[PDB]
Amino acid sequence: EKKCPGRCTLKCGKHERPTLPYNCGKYICCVPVKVK
Structure with a gap:
């Protein structure tokens, strides 16, 4: 269940x-x- 435009839990690192x-x-x- 993704909620985009920018998500894999929250934003990058x-x-x-x-x-x-x-x-x-x-x-x-x-x-x-x-993150990993």
């Missing part, structure tokens, strides 16, 4: 990125994704 569970958001990913 480490490797700032769209759609991958990654480095910025490891979670439900739009583009201002959270």
